[PDB]
Design a protein around this nucleic acid. Structure first.
Lengths: 91, 200, 46, 42, 153, 121, 369, 64, 59
RNA sequence: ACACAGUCGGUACGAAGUCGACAAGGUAGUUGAUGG
RNA sequence: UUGAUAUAAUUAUCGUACAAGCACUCAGCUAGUUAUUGAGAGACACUCACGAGCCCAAA
RNA sequence: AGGCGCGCAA
RNA sequence: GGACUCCUUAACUUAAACUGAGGAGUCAAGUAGGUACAAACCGUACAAGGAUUAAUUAUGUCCAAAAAAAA
RNA sequence: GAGAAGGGAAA
RNA sequence: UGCGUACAUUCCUUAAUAUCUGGAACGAUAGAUUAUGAUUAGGUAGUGGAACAAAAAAAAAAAAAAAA
């Protein structure tokens, strides 16, 4: 069985999400509060409380090599995906 | 051995005398314990904070040739009573029939499993009560007292003179059987339920 | 609403009868014709 | 609303059985002009 | 539908309209194949007619005896199973009608004889008993009351 | 809607004025009508019971046996006819009701062990 | 600052229970707990270690924010005070004669009114102190109306062996007059259900709760009779009349008319609407059988098939013809299982008993709450 | 569940330890189930026989 | 559909959800226009639905 | 309509006949229970 | 007719209020739309496919 | 072309 | 950043359906009964649904209004 | 016999 | 020494979807519905499950009993 649609404002007995709390106890306007992703009140956002971490965002910028596990290499060798009689290369 | 319990009966302010009853603790442990504890008063105060005791309790119903009912420790009129385990306790076993005069059994309300402090003593055989009331004991001495109690009854249940238990306690053949008991498979022993109730 | 209920009741009354005519069907004539074409569709090449 | 009385202690008349002559109205039939013809009142 | 000791049967006719092609009449056609003949054999007093209508919803019309205005009933049989159709048929076979006017409750006893000993009526003794209050009583004063002076004497 | 529109218009049949055909008013009137029915159908049992009780009391007082004594006597005698049956017997079977009253009296009016004759002393 | 617990009680001992107020489980536990602990071992075992209190429990007690929702546990309300009416007396019945010999009351077509004047005069007087066979019966009723006390009989509501329904010794031989009373002069009170009573004569139509697995035209017997009466006598059962039954025929197994149930509360968006049709059984009363020599109903029968007991319908005779039988005629499967009813009242519910009996009745056997 | 014969069976039988006894109730329940199985087999055989008879009747009717 | 809603872990799959059960009293009421009997009861039917006679038994 | 106008119930044929019908009647198809 | 019985509805509100706001009545119009884009994070979020693999843009 | 994931055991 | 009853309190004129705290009960979001009449008191084996059976809850027993005073 | 302090009126 | 009074999952008919009601059971060509199984089913805000909403489209509206 699929999911039934839950359109709002189609009677009091419908199991759609309610509208009364939204009308009465929620801030009016498009954004229901300040237009932001960081606002938590008058207090500072968590990220602004915490100090900056240059190492964290330089690690992401570091160019990295593709990891390969010797267990995976062994499995491929056993199944025959690579030939051990010749030098196994990146290609 | 089986407990022996005494009830001292006064008829209209006169000390009628003492009746002794043997309780069937071997076959009816729960009911016999309830009656013995109500006779001795050891369990103390109850739900309404009155003693769980038969002392100073009336026989509120007497039908000659049929039976006398008493044991209402709350009102003395038939709408009260309580057992030592709570308000009511489960019917234990219909092992014995009401086959003779002087048998003790438990009174009940309309609903099933309404055994409480209220009991009755048979004045004769009551075969129509078998399978509906629990017989748990029998008189051993006090037949004259029982006869005097019977003398105060009316067909409607009214008593000519008040009949009361002015003293009661403990002192420190059997009726016919409704069936023959036999050994049963009991996978879970008795103590396990109690330990579970306490949470093991 | 009332108009939709009335239209649905009339359509239920007429749509199940074969051989009706345009004057009998009124505003439901194209729907009735399409319904009969669909019902015939099964007879093609038997 | 409620009052000094009891709301549910006001008896209502009703029939404890049913029957076919509940609604049979009374109407006057024609009456004899000659009760002298009957022997008891001859 | 029985009365007069099971000699009058109120359900007289049943007319079943069905489609020979529609899938919503699959249960009805199954009933025709497997169960209809047995039902007719067990209920010989009911006339069962089957009418084919290709593009109409299946239904059953029940006609009873009498002119109480509750003797005509119609019930759609769309998408019902053979067992459900049989259940409806048994309901109507056991009814005297669609029972618009049958009420649950009430006195629950319809009779031609209210009373076998006669109704209660006021009588002279009863109407005299109704005036008991006006008779005089004899106050039971019990023992006499004595004065302190008399008791001291 | 709280009640279907067709049911509303069927229930408001026989009402006064616009309540018959205007949905806005018919809805309110039908809501009230069915709510009254719901409450009174639950309430009517005891209103019938008091009627039975009064009828039985009058019938017993006709024989000088009020309802209280009659009820105690029957219940003690193991006669468990209900109030509706007793009222029906009172209003339609007077001889049987009188027999019931006599049986009740036979149990209620018990006699003491010793009776005293003091008419000439 | 400390809140000191209240020790003495005002009323009854407190009792806590789970969930909101409602009708809930009431049967006392199979094995109870003795209030007194006889040993130190019992006293130590009494502790429930799942309730071991800790500072975390204290913090939950003292928290400033919202605590546990209050509707999860509540205080049990005060006990009730049921009347202990049992044991009830030995079931029995009484027959009393009230024959009225006045010509104004013995009119054939029946006076619309009872003779209350005769009732009262006779009460005061008593307080203050085939043709030839029919004539003999008339003589018997004449003797009884002269001396109504000679016709008073008290008997047992339960079988007494060779005595039948008599308290001491067999019933009087003259009690056969009760059989000759016409159905148009008989009425009785009978139960069509566990707690429904009807006053019925012959020819009545009674509505009862659905009798399971019955169809129009079936014959049924109601055995629970509490009062029987004619114009000459009345039998009152204490609580039932053993030697009376009511024959009836099912005329309908139907649904009553439509009923609307609507409830609502204003300004709370609370309302419920529902259409209902209720199952009923209409029964025509055929006759009221009264017979002092009536025999006790036979025990419940042993069906030849158990599947029907749990099927949607009874098996038709064509299907029943395929029952394997023993040489003695009994079905082969009877050896595997006799067919005795597993409980009380199952066969009566299915309609396989000699008659429908409910509970005022010494002869009934079924479950009660 | 037999739709062709309109026969639906659901047994919900209980053999109570309080009424009979643990072991005796177990034995009676086992016997009950065995009897139900036997009756079901016999009913299946009877239904096959009746079906063959019905086919014979229909063929005889079509003969006319 | 089944005799009742199944809540155990074995049946917590959308394949077991939905459906309608059949009950005759509910079927006889659903999808039927409601018709009151207020101004439609025959004079030959009592308000409890039983026979009612319009004339005295003597013609 | 006393009524937010509704809800639950809601009349019990005939003798309206008459060539009628145990113990007394003073013959009324009338009457029996009741001294301080 | 007579007996009993009942303080329209809706919204906000601690508050079941025609001294609170809207509405003569009725017809039609009239308000939770959509992730080729997001997701199941102790207040609830299903379901198929392949599987140490899985998907395949522009063209 | 590209994207995600790729045991921490043996 | 709720209302009222109860217990214990601070403020008030030992005032207020006043203000402010700590705990239980109802209302809020819980009908039908009692308490004379529109939440907060009493009582409920609290309202899925139907029905002309039954029960000692609060609380009553001269009438309005159901319910005792034989000889 | 009581805010019986809804009306009547009771020992 | 009594009685009145509110409460029935006593009877009959339905319902249970945030992984624990027997059911991990009995059936199985697609679940017929539990007969003394249990818990039970007042409800605002919030959350969740189910049944409708008579239409349109689709290349599946005749292998169907008896009658015609």
């Amino acid at each position: 069985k699929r999911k039934s649609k839950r359109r709002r404002g189609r009677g009091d007995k419908s199991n759609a999400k309610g509208i009364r709390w939204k009308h009465v106890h929620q801030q009016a306007g498009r954004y229901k509060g300040p237009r932001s992703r960081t606002f938590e009140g008058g207090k500072l956002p968590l990220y602004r409380r915490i100090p900056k971490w240059p190492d964290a965002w330089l690690a992401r910028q570091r160019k990295v090599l593709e990891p390969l596990n010797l267990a995976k290499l062994r499995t491929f060798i056993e199944s025959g995906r690579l030939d051990t009689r010749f030098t196994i290369t990146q290609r | 051995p089986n407990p022996l319990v005494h009830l001292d009966i006064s008829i209209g302010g006169r000390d009628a005398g003492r009746m002794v009853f043997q309780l069937f603790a071997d076959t009816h442990p729960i009911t016999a314990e309830n009656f013995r504890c109500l006779c001795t008063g050891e369990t103390g105060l109850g739900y309404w904070m009155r003693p769980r005791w038969y002392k100073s309790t009336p026989f509120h119903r007497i039908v000659p040739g049929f039976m006398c009912q008493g044991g209402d420790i709350h009102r003395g009129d038939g709408r009260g009573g309580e057992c030592i385990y709570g308000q009511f306790f489960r019917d234990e076993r219909f092992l014995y029939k009401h086959s003779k005069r002087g048998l003790l059994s438990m009174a009940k309300a309309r609903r099933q499993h309404t055994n409480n402090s209220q009991f009755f003593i048979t004045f004769d055989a009551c075969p129509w009560l078998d399978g509906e009331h629990v017989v748990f004991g029998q008189l051993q001495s006090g037949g004259e007292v029982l006869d005097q109690i019977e003398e105060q009854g009316t067909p409607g249940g009214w008593r000519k003179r008040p009949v009361e238990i002015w003293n009661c306690g403990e002192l420190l053949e059997r009726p016919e059987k409704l069936y023959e008991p036999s050994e049963q498979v009991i996978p879970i022993p008795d103590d396990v339920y109690i330990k579970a109730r306490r949470g093991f | 609403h009332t108009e939709s209920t009335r239209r649905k009741q009339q359509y239920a009354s007429i749509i199940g009868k074969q051989g009706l005519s345009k004057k009998r069907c009124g505003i439901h004539w194209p729907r009735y014709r399409r319904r009969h074409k669909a019902r015939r569709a099964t007879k093609h090449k038997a | 609303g409620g009052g000094p009385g009891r709301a549910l202690c006001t008896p209502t008349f009703h029939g404890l059985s049913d029957g076919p002559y509940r609604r049979l109205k009374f109407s006057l039939k024609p009456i004899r002009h000659d009760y002298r013809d009957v022997l008891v009142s001859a | 539908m029985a009365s007069r000791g099971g000699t009058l049967w109120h359900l007289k006719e049943v007319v079943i309209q069905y489609s020979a092609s529609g899938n919503s009449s699959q249960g009805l056609r199954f009933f025709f194949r497997h169960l209809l003949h047995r039902w007719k054999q067990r209920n010989p007093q009911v006339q069962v007619h089957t009418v084919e209508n290709k593009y109409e919803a299946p239904k059953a019309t029940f006609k009873y005896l009498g002119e109480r205005t509750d003797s005509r009933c119609e019930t759609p049989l769309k998408d019902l199973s053979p067992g459900q159709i049989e259940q409806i048929l048994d309901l109507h076979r056991n009814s005297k009608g669609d029972n618009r006017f049958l009420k649950h409750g009430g006195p629950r006893t319809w009779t031609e004889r209210r009373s076998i000993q006669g109704l209660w009526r006021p009588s002279l003794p009863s109407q005299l008993i109704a005036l008991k209050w006006f008779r005089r009583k004899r106050p039971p004063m019990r023992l006499p009351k004595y004065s302190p002076l008399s008791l001291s004497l | 809607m709280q009640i279907p529109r067709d049911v509303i218009f069927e229930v408001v049949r026989g009402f006064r004025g616009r309540s018959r055909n205007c949905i806005k008013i018919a809805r309110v009137r039908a809501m009230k009508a069915l709510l009254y029915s719901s409450i009174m159908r639950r309430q009517r049992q005891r209103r019938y019971r008091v009627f039975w009780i009064g009828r039985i009391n009058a019938a017993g007082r006709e024989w000088s046996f009020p309802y209280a004594w009659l009820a105690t006597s029957l219940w003690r005698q193991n006669i468990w006819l209900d109030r509706k049956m007793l009222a029906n017997l009172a209003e339609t079977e007077p001889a049987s009701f009188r027999a019931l009253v006599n049986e009740g009296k036979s149990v209620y009016f018990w006699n003491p062990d010793k009776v005293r004759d003091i008419q000439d002393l | 600052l400390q809140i000191y617990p209240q020790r003495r009680v005002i009323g009854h001992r407190i009792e806590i229970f789970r969930g909101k107020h409602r009708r809930r489980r009431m049967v006392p536990p199979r094995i109870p707990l003795h209030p007194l602990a006889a040993n130190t071992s019992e006293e130590t075992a009494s502790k429930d270690m799942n309730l071991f209190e800790t500072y975390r429990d204290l913090q939950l007690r003292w928290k400033k924010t919202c605590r546990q929702r209050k509707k999860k546990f509540n205080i049990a309300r005060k006990w009730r005070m049921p009347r202990n009416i049992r044991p009830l007396p030995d079931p029995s019945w009484t027959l009393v004669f009230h024959v009225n010999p006045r010509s104004g009351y013995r009119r054939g077509r029946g006076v619309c009114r009872d003779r209350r004047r005769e009732n009262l005069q006779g009460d005061q007087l008593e307080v203050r102190a085939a043709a030839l066979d029919a004539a003999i019966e008339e003589e018997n009723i004449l003797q009884i109306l002269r001396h109504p006390e000679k016709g008073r009989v008290e008997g047992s509501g339960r079988p007494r062996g060779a005595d039948g329904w008599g308290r001491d010794g067999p019933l009087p031989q003259w009690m056969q007059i009760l059989q000759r009373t016409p159905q148009e002069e008989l009425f009785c009170v009978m139960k069509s259900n566990v707690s429904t009573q009807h006053k019925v004569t012959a020819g009545d139509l009674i509505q009862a709760e659905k009798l399971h697995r019955k169809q129009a035209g079936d014959k049924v017997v109601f055995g629970t009779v509490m009062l029987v009466g004619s114009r000459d006598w009345t039998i009152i059962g204490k609580p039932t009349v053993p030697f009376a039954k009511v024959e009836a025929t099912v005329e309908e197994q139907t649904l009553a008319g439509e009923t609307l149930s609507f409830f609502y509360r204003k300004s709370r968006r609370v309302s419920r609407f529902r259409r209902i049709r209720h199952c009923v059984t209409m029964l025509r009363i055929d006759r009221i059988v009264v017979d002092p020599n009536m025999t006790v109903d036979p025990p419940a029968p042993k069906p030849d098939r158990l599947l029907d007991l749990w099927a949607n319908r009874w098996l038709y005779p064509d299907e029943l013809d395929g029952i394997k039988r023993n040489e003695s005629g009994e079905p082969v499967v009877s050896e595997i299982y006799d067919g005795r009813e597993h409980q009380k009242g199952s066969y009566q519910r299915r309609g396989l008993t000699a008659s429908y009996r409910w509970y005022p009745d010494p002869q009934s056997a079924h479950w009660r709450p | 569940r037999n739709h062709e014969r309109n026969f639906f069976v659901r047994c919900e039988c209980y053999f109570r330890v309080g009424t009979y006894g643990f072991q005796m109730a177990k034995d009676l329940a086992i016997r009950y189930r065995q009897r139900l199985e036997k009756e079901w087999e016999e009913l299946q055989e009877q239904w096959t026989k009746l079906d063959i008879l019905e086919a014979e009747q229909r063929a005889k009717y079509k003969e006319k | 559909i089944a005799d009742r809603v199944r809540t155990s872990w074995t049946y917590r799959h959308s394949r077991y959800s939905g459906g309608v059960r059949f009950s005759l009293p509910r079927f006889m009421v659903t999808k039927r226009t409601y018709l009151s009997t207020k101004f439609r009861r025959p004079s030959t039917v009592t308000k409890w639905g039983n026979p009612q006679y319009t004339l005295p038994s003597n013609v």
